[PDB]
Structures are given as C-alpha cells and as structure tokens.
Design a protein around this ligand. Structure first.
Ligand SMILES: O=C(c1cc(Cl)c(O)cc1O)N1CCC[C@@H]1c1ccc(CN2CCC(F)(F)C2)cc1
Ligand SMILES: O=C(c1cc(Cl)c(O)cc1O)N1CCC[C@@H]1c1ccc(CN2CCC(F)(F)C2)cc1
Lengths: 220, 223
C-alpha cells in the first residue's frame, strides 16, 4: 500500500571517472566558481541541439518552445539548481554520459593536471560536469527528452550513482542539475555572487539566463 | 509554409451581473486590495485538496505530478505576478462554466453590497473571490491543465468578454496558473517583502507549501 514504489538502479562509475571525482571533490582549488560556467555551457549545448532539431522538425518543440537557462538558489535547502529547456537525456544517455563510459579526456585531464594544466581547463577535456563536485557534496540530475519519461540521476561520489524514474514535478523537456552545496560553499546561493560569476564567465552564452531566488514562505 | 499552430479561439460574454461586478471592482477604491492574493491562494488550496482527495481512492491521478504546492512568481520586467498550483485544474467546460458565464445568487447581493459600499474583503464568502484579481490587474490570464484533458488558456481585460483557447505555451503537468498583469500603481505586489507579509497575514492556515521565486533577468541575457 505504499504511496509509491519504484525501481532504483545503482551503477559503478568507470574507474578513471571515480578517480577524477575523488580528486576534484577532495583537493583544494582556488577558483571553484568555474563550476557554474561549465554547467551553463552544458545547458547551452543542449539548447543548441534541440534548436537545430526543431529547424527540420518543429513538432520537437511541442514539449515547449522557449529555449533558456534558469538559475535557482535556495538558501533554506542549501541547493543551487541550473535548469534548461534543452534536448534532455534518455535513460541510456544518463547511464552512458554520466558515469559508466569514461572518455579519453577523463584520464587525459588527470594526465593534464600533472602536466601543469589548470582545473578551469576541465571543460576543454569534455568533462566539465564533474566540476560540480568542487562545490557540491551531492549532485542530482533530472532530465526529460522528447518521447521519453523523466529520469533522475544522483551521486555523492564514493564510486557509484543511482538512476530512477523521477516522480517529482514534471518538466516539459530539458535537464535540471541540483547541487546540494558543501557547508562552506554557500556563497554560490547569493544573488550578488551568481550575478558576478555569470557576468564574468558566461557573457557569450546565446540564450536567456534568468535568476529565480527561491524562498519557502514561513509555515509553508 | 505551414503554420506552427492553427486553433479556434472562442470569445464569451460575461454573465450580466459578473460584468457589473468586475466594473465595480476595477473602478472603486478600496484600502485593502491585498486580499486578492488571499483569495487566489485559497482557490489553489481548494484545487489541491480536490486532487488529493481524488488520489486517495484513485492513486493514478498523481501520475501527472505527485508534489502538491503553490508557487508565487513576481516578474518586475514583465510587471506580472503569477500564482501557480499543482491542483486538480479545470477542463474547458469547467473553465467556461466557472469563470464568467454563470452567475450565482451571491453576486447580485454582494455586487449590490458594494454598490451599497460594503468591504471588498467579504468577496470570498460570496464565492466570487477570483474577481478580486482586478483590484490589482488590468488583465488576467489563466492557464489550466486537468488530467485527461488539454491545457487551456482563459483571458480577460474586463471589457465584458473573455477568450478561451487550447494553450500552446509551456506545458504544465497539472493544475492552474494565474498570471496577473498588474496595474501601474499596483506594482508593489511584485516586491518580495510585500508578498511575504501578505501571505504571513492572510494565508496562515493554508496546509500546503507556498514558495516565492523572485524572478530576475540577468545582464546581457534577457528575454
Ligand atoms: O541534457 C544535457 C545536459 C547535461 C548536463 Cl551534464 C547539463 O549540466 C545540462 C544539460 O542540458 N545534454 C543533452 C545533450 C547535450 C547536454 C550534454 C550531455 C553530455 C555532456 C558531456 N558530459 C557529461 C558528463 C561528462 F563526463 F562530464 C561529460 C555535456 C552536455
Ligand atoms: O483550477 C482551479 C483554480 C481556479 C482558480 Cl480561479 C484559481 O485561482 C486557482 C485554481 O487552482 N480550481 C479547480 C477546482 C477548484 C479550483 C476552483 C475553481 C472555481 C472556483 C470558484 N470561482 C471561479 C470564479 C468565481 F466566480 F469567482 C468563483 C474556485 C476554485
């Protein structure tokens, strides 16, 4: 008689990816703010892909025409959420894209960090998503692709991640990254901080970026 | 070559007394216009109760979203205040029947109590609370989505008529979204501090999460 029941799948990260996450999540780095640049850049890439699909098949935008990125800090939850209405990811995409298949750059980037490369270059090796763990103890990715159901990926590192169908609020289409911030990284929940980081690092992104400051009202 | 969309747009006349009530609401001063938010939050709470009670005996009714809540979104750039809930929503007929074509006994007497000069606050008791929206809004748009039906848009600028159409905007899972296009001298209801105090004052007993999202477009990234 449960309110609900669903299957949860747990997957091991590919060895190199686990190594990178441990390196990122544990090691001191001076400008972690670049995490937000990498996630906005990923969102922009997703919006490009749906935009170009719609040019040959407009019905692809039946799930929503607006192409944009929302940034949603929630001090009460200590979460920062980046939402886009891009092309989204199938379940296979989540499992493949986000853990089980290490690409050249995974090892290549740890290879480069030894060679004197910087962490802000994590994006040039195509593994920018993982910079999220510079500031987050846990990351949840919720995604909805056309013709597919809405899935939720999550990891606190430690070598594994889970995937399940998301029963939360339905998205029309796109991807939402929920960063559950480390205790000492709450600065990234502040309007002034988010504003300056976007102005500094994401000036060239070609889609609306909008802030929604979230506050749960007292007693509610 | 081909249109993106093609749809019928229907225009309805407001029932006579409803039209009369709206004109009174728009053209009369009241010292406590803030009660409009109480009325719309109350309507959302009712819608939420209904999908919850339905879900008891029929659990699959929450397939369109499990979370039951109310969001308030002020957008200073657009001068809109939006109230969104994940309640049971309205079918096209519910929308037409509820929002303007049928008048109840509680209209002619209330609308006459205001012509007589009563306190606008009593509007909710007479079951016409939605129309308090026009205390602060020059136009109201309602987007609604009921299980097993299409998403519809209702809209009126209170000229004696309103329109209904299938909506082609951003998809809602389920529920109702009220978009208030605010009057120029009623923009205070876009302010965070103002919204907080109104909710704290009038909606203390609403048994659902009410969440404010202060919308701010970022420099060089508008639209
Ligand atoms: O839905 C998303 C998406 C993904 C993330 Cl993570 C996001 O923050 C926002 C998004 O909209 N897509 C769909 C197609 C393009 C975009 C995407 C998909 C995969 C990568 C590669 N990275 C994934 C982990 C990695 F190993 F670091 C390498 C980048 C962008
Ligand atoms: O979708 C909604 C809903 C409607 C409005 Cl307006 C809202 O602000 C939020 C909502 O969720 N429903 C579904 C069922 C219960 C709820 C509802 C429906 C009708 C009335 C009566 N009013 C309609 C005009 C009136 F004449 F003033 C009397 C109240 C609540």
């Amino acid at each position: 008689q449960p309110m609900e029941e669903e299957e949860v799948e747990t997957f091991a990260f590919q060895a190199e990816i686990a190594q990178l996450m441990s390196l990122i999540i544990n090691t001191f780095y001076s400008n972690k703010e670049i995490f937000l640049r990498e996630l906005i850049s990923n969102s922009s890439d997703a919006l490009d892909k749906i935009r170009y699909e719609s040019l040959t098949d407009p019905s692809k935008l039946d799930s929503g025409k607006e192409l944009h990125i929302n940034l949603i800090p929630n001090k009460q939850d200590r979460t920062l959420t980046i939402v886009d209405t891009g092309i989204g990811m199938t379940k296979a995409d989540l499992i493949n894209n986000l853990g089980t298949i290490a690409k050249s750059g995974t090892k290549a980037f740890m290879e480069a960090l030894q060679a004197g490369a910087d962490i802000s270059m994590i994006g040039q090796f195509g593994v920018g998503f993982y910079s999220a763990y510079l500031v987050a103890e846990k990351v949840t990715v919720i995604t909805k692709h056309n013709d597919d159901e809405q899935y939720a990926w999550e990891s606190s590192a430690g070598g594994s991640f889970t995937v399940r169908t998301d029963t939360g609020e339905p998205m029309g289409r796109g991807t939402k990254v929920i960063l559950h911030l480390k205790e000492d990284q709450t600065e990234y929940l502040e309007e002034r901080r988010i504003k300056e980081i976007v102005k500094k690092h994401s000036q060239f992104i070609g889609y609306p970026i909008t802030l929604f400051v979230e506050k749960e009202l007292e007693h509610h």
